[PDB]
């Protein structure tokens, strides 16, 4: 199967660029934070 | 070491480029002044009567 891919080549060069553009899309699409909120077994309630 | 890098000219270039790159990044972060701290430090006690 690897031996067959070497004969083609051209097709898998295009498939690679689709993954790189797909990666570039997912990167920008995914929101950004710093550190997630952890369950610490404790919390507080404010009363004003 | 000289004989090693005569046969490996790309290795020799890689060492040089990495040093130059590290230097380029240092120039951005490095502070600037006329002198460093050459003056000896002083403490002043101010009082009023």
């Amino acid at each position: 199967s690897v031996g067959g891919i070497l004969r083609s080549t051209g097709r898998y060069l295009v498939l690679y660029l689709i993954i790189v553009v797909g990666m570039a899309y997912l990167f920008v699409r995914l929101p950004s934070s710093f550190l997630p909120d952890e369950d610490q077994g404790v919390f507080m309630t404010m009363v004003q | 070491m000289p004989n090693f890098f005569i046969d490996r000219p790309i290795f020799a270039w890689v060492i040089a480029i990495i040093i130059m790159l590290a230097g380029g990044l240092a120039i951005l972060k490095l502070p600037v002044a006329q002198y460093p701290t050459i003056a000896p430090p002083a403490v002043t006690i101010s009082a009023s009567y």
Binding site: - | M1, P2, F5, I6, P9, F11, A12, W13, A16
Partner: protein, 48 residues
Amino acid sequence: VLVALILTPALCATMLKPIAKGDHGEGKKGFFGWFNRMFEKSTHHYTD
């Protein structure tokens, strides 16, 4: 000294042009030709 032991030798092997036996740049025509003849002559004065 590290540049002189690592980079400088690597360049001298790959970059430098071959110099023929006996050639001290006296054959050059222009300023360099005059300087090379002047310097080679000054070396004989010094050594003597």
